[PDB]
Amino acid sequence: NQVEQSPQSLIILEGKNCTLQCNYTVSPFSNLRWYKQDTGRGPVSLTIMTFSENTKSNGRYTATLDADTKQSSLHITASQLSDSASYICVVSDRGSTLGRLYFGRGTQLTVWPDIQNPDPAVYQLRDSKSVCLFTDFDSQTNVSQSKDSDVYITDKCVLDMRSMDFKSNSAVAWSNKSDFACANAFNNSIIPEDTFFP
Amino acid sequence: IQRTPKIQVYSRHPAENKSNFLNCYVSGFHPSDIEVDLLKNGERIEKVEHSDLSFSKDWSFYLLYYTEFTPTEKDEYACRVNHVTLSQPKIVKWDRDM
Amino acid sequence: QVQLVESGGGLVQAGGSLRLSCAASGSMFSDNVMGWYRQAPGQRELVATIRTGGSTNYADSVKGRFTISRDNAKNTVYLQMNSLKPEDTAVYYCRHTIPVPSTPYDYWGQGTQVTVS
Amino acid sequence: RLFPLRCLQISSFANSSWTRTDGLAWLGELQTHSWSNDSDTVRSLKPWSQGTFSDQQWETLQHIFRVYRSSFTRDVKEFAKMLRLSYPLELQVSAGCEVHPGNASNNFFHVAFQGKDILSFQGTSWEPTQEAPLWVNLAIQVLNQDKWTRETVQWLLNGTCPQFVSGLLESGKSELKKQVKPKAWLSRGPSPGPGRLLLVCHVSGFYPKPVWVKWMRGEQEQQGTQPGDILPNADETWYLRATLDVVAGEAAGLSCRVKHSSLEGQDIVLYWGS
Amino acid sequence: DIYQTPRYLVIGTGKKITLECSQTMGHDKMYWYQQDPGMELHLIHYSYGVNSTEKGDLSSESTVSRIRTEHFPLTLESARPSHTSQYLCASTSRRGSYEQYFGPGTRLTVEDLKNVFPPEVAVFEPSEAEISHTQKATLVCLATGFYPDHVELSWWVNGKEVHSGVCTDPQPLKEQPALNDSRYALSSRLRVSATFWQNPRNHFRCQVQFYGLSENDEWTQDRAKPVTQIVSAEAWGRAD
Ligand SMILES: CCCCCCCCCCCCCCCCCCCCCCCCCC(=O)N[C@@H](CO[C@H]1O[C@H](CO)[C@H](O)[C@H](O)[C@H]1O)[C@H](O)[C@H](O)CCCCCCCCCCCCCC
Ligand SMILES: *[C@@H]1O[C@H](CO)[C@@H](O[C@@H]2O[C@H](CO)[C@@H](O)[C@H](O)[C@H]2NC(C)=O)[C@H](O)[C@H]1NC(C)=O
Fold first, then answer.
1. Same domain, residue pair E192 and E95
2. D interface toward E at CB cutoff 8 Å?
3. Smallest CA–CA distance from B4 into chain D, residue
4. Which of E81, E96, E111 marks a domain boundary?
5. Same domain, A129 and A84
6. Are both A22 and A86 inside the same structural domain?
7. Are E120 and E229 in the same domain?
8. A9 contact D CB<8A
9. Where are the disulfide bridges (chain B)?
10. Which structural domain range is residue E79 located in?
11. Quick one: which atom of ligand 2 is closest to the CA of D40?
12. Contacts of C25 (CB under 8 A, 6+ apart)
């Protein structure tokens, strides 16, 4: 297509810095726009660089541009958790209010937390008139989902307690039938042996 | 907002009868597409050479059509044009004198 | 058809100061722009807008640090590099082109090297 | 002794599906380049039509217009939708620059719509006609918001335009200073009244457009001497006819006087009898 | 700012479409887009002025109208399942920093109304093993048995909403991995320090907002009308 974006999907850690690239073939050219779409919300305008404006920054974001090679990049530093969304590359082939807009296919990233002290464990809690949970996992450790439709298994998602600078993983799985044993509810997922579960 | 044109036909050489060519000048037409034909006393000339259309300070167009020939004591020539400002295509016959 | 003269390269230590040369000739083109682009090994960045006659704009990383000058005859350009920083080492190319993009008139010099110790 | 540059642009839009854009350039009174909607290049008619610019100083320009040709068309296609303009559409654009002695000059850029000009270009921003419709005003806003274009144009009127002219005069002085001797004769016109006849003075095949011609009785300029409009020809040498209504008995000693640069005082002596 | 209603909506196939949009910045130009989830963007219509309404590269059966500068509502005559996506009114300023401004967006879903379900109340008190080993207590809320997935989950502590320490799952999961009418199910967690969970003076509320049926839509089934209502399940702080 007239605007190819790279890479499709990328995963990085909290506090790291990485880059997002964008390559376009559109003739003509007027300006370049990097946008950020909150998951399930309207995307937001960030950098609006004409072809003279090579670089521009809004906060912890800093995009670059080389029109001679028709190539855009996007540098962010010290990745926070809130940075996780889908990112787009938009070009307008006019400068006035007549340019057609050429969106890139869109990239999406994930900033995982780097947890220094991991204590993986599995607990069971009351359902106030049934579900076991697993938490505090090495973010690099991976999960699979249920073998049979009777059993349900979610995926990872992290949480932040800004009051005490705590950021920890979490995961949940359950079923209805009485055969629901928490010891084997995760066997499809490879988990470390240091996991202690009551 | 619509100007109709003004046609003028003339020859390059004062000919007796003496290869010469002829020119038809049209100007002051407010739109720009017109059907034009030089007619040898009732019939058109396929082999013809024209120039590049322009307009004047008032943006009123003008153009010139020329063609080489050999004039007669008998035949008559004219310049025909169909424009939006004319329902009927106006013709201007050439005076071999003035 | 243009002329490519880049001169003024060398090695320096931190906090140094240099001056660069660039001119063009032959099939030239009245109002134009010259200047330089540094390429840190990796990426050519603007540094100096020349805008023959027309007011200009430098780079923020060198805001006030570096300053240019126009030959104003030989259509040559001089740049005064001052208060150099160690990280400012890169390949420095001279460019002469007009302020309209994507033209075949975008000529690039042979390239000059700058190293700060 | 002035030779202005007139770049002419013609672009017709009958319906949304079909359009053509052609253009050319006049210097003073001479054509140098033709450019069709069919050709990806502007045609240098003269060998010196390229001026002083090398095939790269030249092609560079061809790169702009070729893009400009494509660019201009969609704009107006979408322009009309924003402005609800009942088709068809006829747009004309007159532009160039003209030099003053030494290193001073002035430029221009006049655009016209349906045989009525709309806006011009003043300084560094678009300005409409004082007798222009309003929709033009909202259009004036939109165009001023594309600066690179605004800059791209000043770079042409201001600067690059006049240098190229200088790059042509040295290349075209021979053709420029050329002069062509007219060919004059007389003929009878049909009588405009009883007895009073119409005397025609013919001039054809000359070069430098400007000429003064009057019917005279030896040295007496005749009021009734009426002439028409100067008209062209194929090889760039023009033609003209001057007339006069007088009675036959007054045709004795009358003469048509011809004054043009191609002869210097050896005026075309034509009394009534040749 | 720029407003478009409603965030979520559901209707029957072949019926007429209510799509609205509003703008308080006086911009002349507005947009409409179509994005299917996980895919890129697609333009469909636009208006350069008050009386303009034009079609985009995608030929569709939409009814883009604009008679007002503020309202740029899109309409659609007959409904069809292939239309299910997200739609984003947009706007730009008449001068400078053409920051294309976007509206919040609307989620669209359209065979039968007997497939609609309100979700389950669901709160879960923590585990002591976690409180003992971590000095912090984790709560979790669960909503199941519902259709469609137009849901707004929100935790509520002592009368106030909270966003510090929560983690609602990003997207729901179907009750049946194969069925197209399959109801969904999601998980939402929350973890606080133990000392807080002990204190009984703390109130905890997991609230879920469901954007269900209209007020006029004919409902006849064994069930009650799964209207747009709020399914909240609460809890109290407990020192065991
Ligand atoms: C005067 C210059 C002297 C040149 C001398 C050359 C002599 C050689 C022989 C010439 C013979 C042929 C003569 C043909 C007639 C020549 C007309 C010259 C007009 C040149 C002005 C425009 C130069 C090209 C600029 C252009 O293409 N603009 C483009 C591209 O812009 C995009 O791309 C650019 C970079 O590629 C920029 O980034 C820009 O921001 C972005 O939006 C921009 O999009 C413009 O809006 C497009 C139209 C421009 C014409 C404006 C006319 C306004 C009046 C029309 C109103 C009609 C209303 C009713 C419908
Ligand atoms: C003017 O020239 C352009 C291009 O040179 C013509 O438009 C295109 O012609 C190509 C021919 O292969 C088609 O594939 C494109 O679809 C045409 N473009 C459009 C927008 O339709 C145009 O037809 C020419 N004008 C005239 C009057 O011949």
1. no
2. 78, 81-84, 141, 145
3. D115
4. E111
5. no
6. yes
7. yes
8. no
9. 24-79
10. 1-111
11. 5
12. C2, C3, C74, C75
